[PDB]
Amino acid sequence: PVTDHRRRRAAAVISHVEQETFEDENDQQMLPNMNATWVDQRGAWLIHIVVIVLLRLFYSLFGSTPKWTWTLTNMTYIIGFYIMFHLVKGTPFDFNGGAYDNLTMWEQINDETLYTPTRKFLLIVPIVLFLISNQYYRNDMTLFLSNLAVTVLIGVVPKLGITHRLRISIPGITGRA
Amino acid sequence: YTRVPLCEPEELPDDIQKENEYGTLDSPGHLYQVKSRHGKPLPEPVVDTPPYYISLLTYLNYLILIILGHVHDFLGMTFQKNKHLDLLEHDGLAPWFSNFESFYVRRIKMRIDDCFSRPTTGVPGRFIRCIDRISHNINEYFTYSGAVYPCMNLSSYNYLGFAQSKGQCTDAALESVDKYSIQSGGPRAQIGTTDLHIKAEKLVARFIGKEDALVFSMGYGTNANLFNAFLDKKCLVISDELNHTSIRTGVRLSGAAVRTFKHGDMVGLEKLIREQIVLGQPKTNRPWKKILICAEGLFSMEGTLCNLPKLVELKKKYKCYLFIDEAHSIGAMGPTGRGVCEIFGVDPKDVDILMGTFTKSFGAAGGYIAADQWIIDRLRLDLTTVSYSESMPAPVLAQTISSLQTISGEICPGQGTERLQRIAFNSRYLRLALQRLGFIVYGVADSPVIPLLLYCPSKMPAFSRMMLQRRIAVVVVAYPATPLIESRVRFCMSASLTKEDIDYLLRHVSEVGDKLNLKSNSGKSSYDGKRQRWDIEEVIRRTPEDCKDDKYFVN
Amino acid sequence: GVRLSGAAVRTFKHGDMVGLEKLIREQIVLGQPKTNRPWKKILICAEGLFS
Ligand SMILES: C[C@@H]1CC[C@@]2(OC1)O[C@H]1C[C@H]3[C@@H]4CC=C5C[C@@H](OCCC(CO[C@H]6O[C@H](CO)[C@@H](O[C@H]7O[C@H](CO)[C@@H](O)[C@H](O)[C@H]7O)[C@H](O)[C@H]6O)CO[C@H]6O[C@H](CO)[C@@H](O[C@H]7O[C@H](CO)[C@@H](O)[C@H](O)[C@H]7O)[C@H](O)[C@H]6O)CC[C@]5(C)[C@H]4CC[C@]3(C)[C@H]1[C@@H]2C
Ligand SMILES: CCCCCCCCCCCCCCCCCCCCCCCCCCC(=O)N[C@@H](CO)[C@H](O)[C@H](O)CCCCCCCCCCCCCC
């Protein structure tokens, strides 16, 4: 081959995305991403509170018990955020030649900067939501355990210094480099 | 019916046609002369924002659109496959394009596609003729009928009104056709070059103010095939985040390292220059062979000017090079029309390389590059387009030469200055009136592009269709071309329009905006720090006199 | 003399050519301290017979 541009699919229990070469990194990431730039903008922080309030009011319009309402709103918010950010990999529009085909939107925020204020806020929201919500279903231990498990396993572990560029081949042979 | 009809030209007297293409001035009081800034630097621009609920509503609308689009795609492509035969593998062959890489075009823009790709006919002058069409399914296919109606033109790149079929330029082009055929033998190296090429190059070099210049057939190829001639993998390019795709393609083909700085932020540029000079090349820390700075004269999406003296002093201090693009600034900006250099008074010797395009003002197709003697002498041997591509045709050369001579003043005296005064007055009057009504308008005081912000996505099709029903042509842009919050409508002013047309447009736009609730001004646009919600009659009566004064513009 | 000159000094073990080659390669690649610029020149000093 005169170019040697291929995608690898090495299989292992624990694997990481290899560091980009000179051409892919220093040259093919120069223009605004247009997929993660909108995070640090106007009105990008209150919208989460608005969504939480709207979900809580929509569930309360049904007329259910507070415990079920708050558990459902926590689960729905966390699952929606996960589906939006952590699950999908890529970008809806061609960037240069497919440079961002191995990373999620979370990794692309602020040009792969580990600690920025928006990341701190996004991590803080689920914890405060859990502390506010648990006060209604403390009596039931099963629901408390379920809420704690959802929060820790979905809304806490991915947003960590570890598990950055971390892939597991259990649900499918992932692609690295 | 499905195919686009071929329209037979209409028979009209001469005067009606001349009035259709170019207007006639009513009073000598509708002209303005542009001054030159000697030692006044450009102040930092100020922008205005709407209240929060607009942003929240926009975010909710986009969230709903994305959710329903993805759900529809998944359900439709899981429960049935006969209709979606262009997005699945057939007889062991992959599809042409991918599902995820074209989500937006198929799922959001396709429902409002009637606002794009509008067929027209005739000269694109003051009034542009359009062919009617009927939407079928959801903007899938169209049926055409033999009917053509005129519309007011606010969507064409015609600044000085050179798009005419009756004048000196048309006669020059016809004489050129009579003398030189439309045939071009081949590349300029082999047989292509003639005497008219040399005449045009010398005239362009004299007009711009540099030593020598070259000509090309396409503006895109001027940038796409230029940077590989003198750049390599050991050079650094610092460019604004808002540059045309041709520059990015040329730099990508060259292979040099690219670092970008935020628009209108000189401190970050200085910090980046210092850090890149200190650190050096990656993995080896050798010094950079050379450093080049790329910038554009006037930015079309915002109508803002670049700060030239700051760049000149920075490059002189740190020993860098400068590249300036003047697609939207040549022939329309400055007391005479030389460009931003005449506006700021900076000598052209400071800028190493200048570029331009003849499509936006001179009514032709081509491009040019202007530099010193030895640089051009080397680049002529080291370029790719000269000895591998075609050559410029003769009618385009004749049109360009006639337009440049007319603007310079050698022939047809008392025309270029009058056109420049017309366009300046029109731009200033429209911008001031729009700001006084209560809208949000970006850009400098004298810029032919007037962007008006329309935030909510559902307000673009409604505004466009209502304006089309009232015989006004507009252009709307949206995500991903523009930021998610900010979507805008762009106005391109001409020297062929008249104050009565501006009044007609102002009345209709004001009433439509009142209907759609597009007036959101926070008082930072006004120079006295108060909200402005005036009447149309009062604005029409007072603005034309106060349009000339420069104290009513914040920037 | 070298101390009065002011140049950088690196020493290699007596009768060990492999270490000398490794040191030469590393010093050519690395460059000057704190700047990683290439050395202007390199000089090798040795004695004929060691007393
Ligand atoms: C009862 C309850 C009710 C409630 C509830 O639960 C049930 O209701 C349920 C309703 C559920 C949703 C239903 C549907 C979706 C869309 C799905 O998808 C998004 C879009 C795509 C996202 O991106 C991927 O796709 C990128 C594509 O480039 C990949 O990129 C790389 O890989 C490239 C490979 O070429 C290389 O180029 C490079 O290495 C690189 O570019 C990368 O993997 C990854 O980024 C993925 O999907 C698309 O892509 C598929 C593959 O092409 C399409 O085809 C496939 O599906 C066809 C279907 O007929 C079949 O023929 C075949 O299986 C096959 O052809 C599929 O149709 C289409 O959707 C994401 C999940 C979601 C939202 C579900 C969430 C859970 C629910 C809300 C449940 C909810 C909780
Ligand atoms: C009445 C039922 C209940 C209603 C509630 C519905 C669910 C709402 C729950 C809250 C969800 C979390 C809220 C956080 C978000 C706050 C507001 C953000 C506003 C929109 C931002 C748009 C950004 C555009 C950037 C473009 C981009 O780059 N896109 C992609 C690739 O990078 C991303 O992959 C892409 O966007 C996500 C694709 C996800 C596809 C969704 C598929 C789900 C199908 C529907 C199933 C239900 C899901 C909800 C449980």
Quote the tokens at residue B30: 């509708």
Whether a cis peptide bond, with omega within 30° of 0, leads into B480 is yes
Quote the tokens at residue B193: 């070059």
| C29 CA: distance to closest CA in chain B (Å) | 8
CB B293 within 8 A of CB B240: no
Using the Cβ of C36 and the Cβ atoms of chain B, whether some distance falls under 8 Å is answered with yes
Q: Chain C contacts of B280, Cβ < 8 Å?
A: 36
Which 3 state secondary structure label does DSSP give B141?
strand
User: Which residue in this structure is represented by tokens 């450093």?
Assistant: B291
Number of C-beta neighbours around residue B364 at 10 A: 21
Using the Cβ of C11 and the Cβ atoms of chain B, whether some distance falls under 8 Å is answered with no
Residue B285 to residue C38, Cβ atoms within 8 A:
no
CB A125 within 8 A of CB A131: no
φ and ψ at B517, to 5 degrees?
Answer: 60, 65
**Of B14, B34, B12, nearest in space to B22 by CA:** B14
Cα–Cα dist A36/A41, whole Å: 10
Report the nearest atom of ligand 1 relative to the CA of A175: 39
Measured by CA distance, the residue closest to atom 14 of ligand 2 is A81
Amino acid of residue B427 = S
Cα–Cα dist A137/A118, whole Å: 30
CB A92 within 8 A of CB B101: yes
Rg (CA), chain B: 25
**DSSP run (H or E) holding A127:** helix A117-133
CB B297 within 8 A of CB B327: yes
3-state secondary structure B451-474: EEECCCCCHHHHHHHHHHHCCECC
| Alpha helices (H) in B209-349, listed in sequence order | 219-224, 245-254, 266-279, 308-318, 340-344
Angle at A14 between CA A13 and CA A18, to 5 degrees: 130
CB B125 within 8 A of CB B164: yes
| Alpha helices (H) in B83-194, listed in sequence order | 103-107, 168-179
Using the Cβ of B286 and the Cβ atoms of chain C, whether some distance falls under 8 Å is answered with yes
Task: Name the region of A158 (left: φ>0; alpha: ψ -120 to 50; beta: rest).
Answer: alpha
Distance from the Cα of residue B524 to its chain's centroid: 27
CB B163 within 8 A of CB B125: yes
Report the nearest atom of ligand 2 relative to the CA of B63: 20
Cα–Cα dist A100/B418, whole Å: 53
B221-224: long-range contacts, CB 8 A cutoff, minimum separation 24: B221/B367, B221/B385, B221/B389, B222/B246, B222/B355, B222/B357, B222/B367, B222/B368, B222/B369, B222/B385, B223/B247, B223/B249, B223/B250, B223/B325, B223/B355, B224/B249, B224/B250, B224/B253
Q: How far is CA B219 from CA B29, B365, C2, in A?
A: 37, 8, 62
With 0-12 / 13-18 / 19 or more C-beta atoms within 10 angstroms meaning exposed / middle / buried, residue B191 is: exposed
Distance from the Cα of residue B415 to its chain's centroid: 24
Regarding beta strands B212-216 and B367-371, do their DSSP bridges make them parallel or antiparallel, or are they unpaired? antiparallel
- The dihedral over CA atoms of B152, B14, B167, B126, expressed in degrees to the nearest 10, equals 0
Using the Cβ of B52 and the Cβ atoms of chain A, whether some distance falls under 8 Å is answered with yes
CA of B77 to the centre of ligand 1 (A): 10
Report the nearest atom of ligand 2 relative to the CA of B74: 44
CB B383 within 8 A of CB B225: yes
CB B153 within 8 A of CB B128: yes
Mutation choice for A interface testing from B64, B97, B101 by most A CBs within 10 A: B101
The closest ligand to the CA of B55 turns out to be 2
Cα–Cα dist B60/B41, whole Å: 42
Q: Chain C contacts of B283, Cβ < 8 Å?
A: none
Return the DSSP state at A72. Answer: H
CB B217 within 8 A of CB B390: yes
**Of B420, B211, B425, B423, nearest in space to B336 by CA:** B420
Task: Name the region of B278 (left: φ>0; alpha: ψ -120 to 50; beta: rest).
Answer: alpha
User: Which residue in this structure is represented by tokens 């003398």?
Assistant: B179
Pocket test for ligand 1, best of A78, A82, A83 (most atoms within 8 A of CB): A83
> Sign of torsion, CA B452 B454 B455 B461?
negative
Which 3 state secondary structure label does DSSP give B180?
coil
φ and ψ at B223, to 5 degrees?
Answer: -85, -35
With 0-12 / 13-18 / 19 or more C-beta atoms within 10 angstroms meaning exposed / middle / buried, residue C5 is: exposed
> Sign of torsion, CA B393 B396 B402 B407?
negative
Regarding beta strands B304-305 and B298-299, do their DSSP bridges make them parallel or antiparallel, or are they unpaired? antiparallel
Using the Cβ of B284 and the Cβ atoms of chain C, whether some distance falls under 8 Å is answered with yes
Q: How far is CA C4 from CA C12, C40, C44, in A?
A: 21, 19, 17
Rg (CA), chain A: 19
The CB of A105 under 6 Å from ligand 2? The reply is: yes
Does B have 3 or more CB contacts under 8 Å with C?
Answer: yes
Cα–Cα dist A51/B338, whole Å: 54
Number of C-beta neighbours around residue B224 at 10 A: 21
Residue B101 to residue A93, Cβ atoms within 8 A:
yes
Which 3 state secondary structure label does DSSP give B479?
coil
CB neighbour burial string for B45-65, b if at least 16 within 10 angstroms, e if fewer: eeebbbeeebbeebbeebeee
Those residues with Cβ within 8 angstroms of residue A151's Cβ, 6 or more apart along the chain or in another chain: A74, A78, A126, A127, A130
**Within chain C, how many helices (H) and strands (E) appear?**
2, 0
Cα–Cα dist B273/B321, whole Å: 12
Rg (CA), chain C: 13
- HSE (side-chain half, CA atoms, 13 Å) at B486: 19
Report the nearest atom of ligand 1 relative to the CA of B78: 59
Q: How far is CA B185 from CA B188, B380, B394, B409, in A?
A: 9, 19, 12, 33
Q: How many CB pairs under 8 A join A and B?
A: 47
Helix, strand, coil percentages (3-state) for chain A, rounded to 5, are 50, 5, 45
Q: Name residues contacting ligand 1 (CB within 6 A).
A: A 83, 88-90, 101, 175; B 70, 73-74, 77-78, 98-100
Quote the tokens at residue C34: 């704190």
Residue B480 to residue A32, Cβ atoms within 8 A:
no
Closest residue, chain B, to A29 (C-alpha): B258
Which 3 state secondary structure label does DSSP give B34?
coil
Does C have 3 or more CB contacts under 8 Å with A?
Answer: no
Those residues with Cβ within 8 angstroms of residue B518's Cβ, 6 or more apart along the chain or in another chain: B439, B454, B459, B463
CB B250 within 8 A of CB B228: yes
**Of B315, B527, B521, B319, nearest in space to B437 by CA:** B521
Q: Chain B contacts of C37, Cβ < 8 Å?
A: 285-287
Cα–Cα dist B244/B252, whole Å: 13
CB A37 within 8 A of CB A118: no
Quote the tokens at residue A152: 């820790």
Amino acid of residue B258 = V
Q: How far is CA A50 from CA A40, A55, A57, B185, B311, in A?
A: 18, 9, 11, 67, 45
Regarding beta strands B257-261 and B236-240, do their DSSP bridges make them parallel or antiparallel, or are they unpaired? parallel
**Of B546, B61, B34, nearest in space to B339 by CA:** B34
Which 3 state secondary structure label does DSSP give B382?
helix
Closest residue, chain A, to B100 (C-alpha): A92
Distance from the Cα of residue A7 to its chain's centroid: 24
**DSSP run (H or E) holding B323:** strand B321-325
Amino acid of residue B499 = K
Using the Cβ of C38 and the Cβ atoms of chain B, whether some distance falls under 8 Å is answered with yes
Q: How far is CA B543 from CA B490, B499, B504, in A?
A: 22, 12, 15
Those residues with Cβ within 8 angstroms of residue B115's Cβ, 6 or more apart along the chain or in another chain: B460, B461, B464, B465, B476
Helix, strand, coil percentages (3-state) for chain B, rounded to 5, are 40, 15, 45
CB B208 within 8 A of CB B215: no
Q: How far is CA B120 from CA B4, B22, B508, C44, in A?
A: 10, 18, 23, 81
Measured by CA distance, the residue closest to atom 20 of ligand 2 is B63
| B73 CA: distance to closest CA in chain A (Å) | 14
Quote the tokens at residue A93: 């529009």
Residue C38 to residue B284, Cβ atoms within 8 A:
no
> Sign of torsion, CA B311 B317 B323 B326?
positive
Which 3 state secondary structure label does DSSP give A152?
helix
Which 3 state secondary structure label does DSSP give B438?
coil
Residue-wise DSSP of B504-541? HHHHHHHHHHHHHT-----SSSSTTSS-----HHHHHH
**DSSP run (H or E) holding B130:** strand B127-136
Angle at B64 between CA B60 and CA B65, to 5 degrees: 115
Q: Chain B contacts of A38, Cβ < 8 Å?
A: 483-485
Quote the tokens at residue B395: 């009618």
CB B311 within 8 A of CB B320: no
Cα–Cα dist B509/B452, whole Å: 11
Cα–Cα dist B159/B362, whole Å: 9
3-state secondary structure B64-82: HHHHHHHHHHHHHHHHCCC
Cα–Cα dist B149/B219, whole Å: 32
φ and ψ at B132, to 5 degrees?
Answer: -75, 155
The CB of B63 under 6 Å from ligand 2? The reply is: yes
Query: Resolution of the deposited coordinates, in angstroms?
Result: 3.3
**For residue B369, what are the β-bridge partners?**
B214, B355
Cα–Cα dist B326/B358, whole Å: 10
Look at chain C and count its residues. Answer: 51
Report the nearest atom of ligand 2 relative to the CA of A36: 28
Cα–Cα dist A110/A114, whole Å: 8
Using the Cβ of C51 and the Cβ atoms of chain B, whether some distance falls under 8 Å is answered with no
Measured by CA distance, the residue closest to atom 41 of ligand 2 is B67
Q: How far is CA A42 from CA A116, B49, B507, B515, in A?
A: 16, 9, 32, 27
User: Which residue in this structure is represented by tokens 């003051």?
Assistant: B126
With 0-12 / 13-18 / 19 or more C-beta atoms within 10 angstroms meaning exposed / middle / buried, residue B247 is: buried
Pocket test for ligand 1, best of A5, A89, A93, A167 (most atoms within 8 A of CB): A89
CB B151 within 8 A of CB B129: yes
**For residue A176, what are the β-bridge partners?**
A8
Which 3 state secondary structure label does DSSP give B52?
helix
Residue C35 to residue B285, Cβ atoms within 8 A:
yes
- HSE (side-chain half, CA atoms, 13 Å) at B374: 0
Interhelix angle A66-82/A117-133, rounded to 10 degrees, is: 160
**Of B182, B214, B220, nearest in space to B198 by CA:** B214
Measured by CA distance, the residue closest to atom 12 of ligand 1 is B71
φ and ψ at B295, to 5 degrees?
Answer: -155, 165
User: Which residue in this structure is represented by tokens 């051409």?
Assistant: A23
Using the Cβ of A50 and the Cβ atoms of chain B, whether some distance falls under 8 Å is answered with yes
**For residue B492, what are the β-bridge partners?**
B449
With 0-12 / 13-18 / 19 or more C-beta atoms within 10 angstroms meaning exposed / middle / buried, residue A172 is: exposed
Quote the tokens at residue B303: 């109508």
Using the Cβ of A43 and the Cβ atoms of chain B, whether some distance falls under 8 Å is answered with yes
| C36 CA: distance to closest CA in chain B (Å) | 6
Task: Name the region of B113 (left: φ>0; alpha: ψ -120 to 50; beta: rest).
Answer: alpha
CB B386 within 8 A of CB B189: yes
φ and ψ at A33, to 5 degrees?
Answer: -70, -35
Q: Which of A22, A30, A41 sits opposite B282 (nearest CB)?
A: A22
Which 3 state secondary structure label does DSSP give B441?
strand
Using the Cβ of C35 and the Cβ atoms of chain B, whether some distance falls under 8 Å is answered with yes
